[PDB]
């Protein structure tokens, strides 16, 4: 297998997706900060250049009507890498791409939080990618934390899946956001939440024809200040366990991360269009949107009748292994640190990747 950059319309063959049907009737939603202007043109880009058929888009100002739903140039390159991995990996097709805009005028972290209740209270996205977060320590010290959780609760309980990254930094999560503190590990909010599936980052091997080889943890290593790039990974300090997590044994009863894992390396990462060029770009935030991607097309193949999965995920797939693909070499630390991934569920790629065809049949026979 080989280390190479994929455009986001190859990961359904990668994930084992091209027999399940696409995301066509499964609408879709996208957390951002600000506006998505450049993003769009951006978009259309993507789908031109691929011969594929248009994306009908929505935008939603989700706070005040006089907040600043500006452009951030830095930001459009998120919302790039999220919109375009999401698509690719829905096989080319959603319904819908609603994108839920954060107003950036607002104090604390309410422009977010409001994003995230708009998305629930329409209800109309089936699932919600978030690629983006913080130490959890830090929302937890502000009330972010709990404001947040509420409204996850909200979406768990209405059948909405919001999906979120785990992190870039590793088990340095709250060390300045990634600084290598020896034996201090620490996890990312939203990710924490048990209401949320939270999606952590491989390394991606394929052979020459581009079929699936294998996958390692992301850890690529310090850049030039000193800063760790990895999978985010671990156990939140104040979410409890739930308790379809019971079957991982010799953990602590506290909420684990991920729950699943997808390619973030950026040396493996996605192609992706951004102010017009073309962008080699990992992390985690784009995990999450690939997992996005494949779960639309499983609810568009289910009309869109699986709730929230994270109890099944655990059940299925700790009794039936074919279902992922088990990462089980490295680690996500530093200097000797960190977690190390291992046989079964690991703290830094949880349950690993998910065979999409394999787990289109279980449901077929058991439900979701
Ligand atoms: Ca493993």
């Not at 297998?1 to 996208?30: Q, R």
């Not at 594929?52 to 919302?79: K, P």
């Given at each position: 297998?080989?280390?190479?950059?994929?455009?986001?319309?190859?990961?359904?063959?990668?994930?084992?997706?091209?027999?399940?049907?696409?995301?066509?009737?499964?609408?879709?939603?996208?957390?951002?900060?600000?506006?998505?202007?450049?993003?769009?043109?951006?978009?259309?880009q993507?789908?031109?250049?691929?011969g594929?058929?248009?994306?009908?888009?929505?935008?939603?100002?989700?706070?005040?009507?006089?907040?600043?739903?500006?452009?951030?140039?830095?930001?459009?390159?998120?919302?790039?890498?999220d919109?375009?991995?999401?698509?690719?990996?829905?096989?080319?097709?959603?319904?819908?791409?609603?994108?839920?805009?954060?107003?950036?005028?607002?104090?604390?972290?309410?422009?977010?939080?409001?994003?995230?209740?708009?998305?629930?209270?329409?209800?109309?996205?089936?699932?919600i990618?978030?690629?983006?977060?913080?130490?959890?320590?830090?929302?937890?010290?502000?009330?972010?934390?709990?404001?947040?959780?509420?409204?996850?609760?909200?979406?768990?309980?209405?059948?909405?899946?919001?999906?979120?990254?785990?992190?870039?930094?590793?088990?340095?999560?709250?060390?300045?956001?990634?600084?290598?503190?020896?034996?201090?590990?620490?996890?990312?909010?939203?990710?924490?939440?048990?209401?949320?599936?939270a999606?952590?980052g491989?390394?991606?091997?394929?052979?020459?024809?581009?079929?699936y080889?294998?996958?390692?943890?992301?850890?690529?290593?310090?850049?030039?200040?000193?800063?760790?790039?990895?999978?985010?990974?671990?156990?939140?300090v104040?979410?409890?366990?739930?308790?379809?997590?019971?079957?991982?044994?010799?953990?602590?009863?506290?909420?684990?991360?991920?729950?699943?894992?997808?390619?973030?390396?950026?040396?493996?990462?996605?192609?992706?269009?951004?102010?017009?060029?073309?962008?080699?770009?990992?992390?985690?935030?784009?995990?999450?949107?690939?997992?996005?991607?494949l779960?639309?097309?499983?609810?568009?193949?289910?009309?869109?009748?699986?709730?929230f999965?994270?109890?099944?995920?655990?059940?299925?797939?700790?009794?039936?292994?074919?279902?992922?693909?088990?990462?089980?070499?490295?680690?996500?630390?530093?200097?000797?640190?960190?977690?190390?991934?291992?046989?079964?569920?690991?703290?830094?790629?949880?349950?690993?990747?998910?065979?999409?065809?394999?787990?289109?049949?279980?449901?077929?026979?058991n439900?979701?």
């Open positions: 297998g080989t280390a190479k950059g994929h455009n986001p319309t190859e990961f359904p063959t990668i994930y084992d997706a091209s027999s399940a049907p696409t995301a066509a009737n499964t609408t879709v939603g996208i957390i951002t900060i600000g506006g998505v202007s450049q993003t769009l043109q951006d978009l259309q993507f789908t031109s250049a691929n594929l058929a248009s994306v009908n888009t929505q935008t939603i100002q989700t706070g005040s009507s006089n907040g600043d739903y500006s452009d951030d140039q830095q930001g459009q390159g998120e919302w790039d890498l919109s375009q991995s999401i698509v690719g990996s829905a096989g080319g097709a959603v319904q819908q791409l609603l994108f839920y805009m954060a107003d950036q005028s607002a104090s604390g972290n309410t422009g977010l939080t409001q994003a995230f209740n708009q998305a629930v209270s329409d209800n109309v996205a089936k699932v990618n978030v690629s983006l977060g913080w130490c959890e320590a830090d929302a937890n010290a502000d009330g972010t934390l709990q404001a947040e959780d509420r409204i996850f609760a909200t979406a768990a309980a209405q059948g909405q899946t919001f999906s979120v990254s785990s992190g870039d930094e590793g088990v340095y999560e709250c060390n300045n956001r990634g600084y290598p503190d020896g034996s201090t590990y620490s996890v990312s909010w939203p990710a924490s939440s048990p209401n949320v599936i999606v952590g491989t390394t991606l091997y394929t052979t020459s024809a581009g079929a080889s294998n996958e390692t943890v992301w850890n690529e290593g310090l850049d030039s200040n000193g800063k760790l790039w990895a999978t985010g990974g671990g156990y939140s104040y979410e409890s366990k739930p308790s379809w997590q019971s079957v991982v044994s010799g953990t602590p009863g506290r909420r684990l991360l991920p729950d699943i894992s997808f390619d973030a390396a950026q040396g493996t990462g996605a192609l992706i269009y951004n102010y017009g060029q073309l962008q080699q770009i990992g992390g985690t935030s784009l995990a999450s949107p690939i997992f996005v991607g779960w639309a097309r499983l609810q568009s193949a289910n009309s869109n009748s699986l709730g999965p994270a109890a099944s995920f655990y059940s299925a797939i700790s009794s039936t292994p074919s279902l992922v693909h088990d990462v089980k070499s490295g680690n996500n630390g530093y200097g000797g640190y960190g977690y190390n991934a291992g046989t079964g569920w690991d703290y830094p790629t949880g349950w690993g990747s998910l065979d999409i065809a394999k787990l289109s049949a279980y449901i077929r026979s439900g979701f």
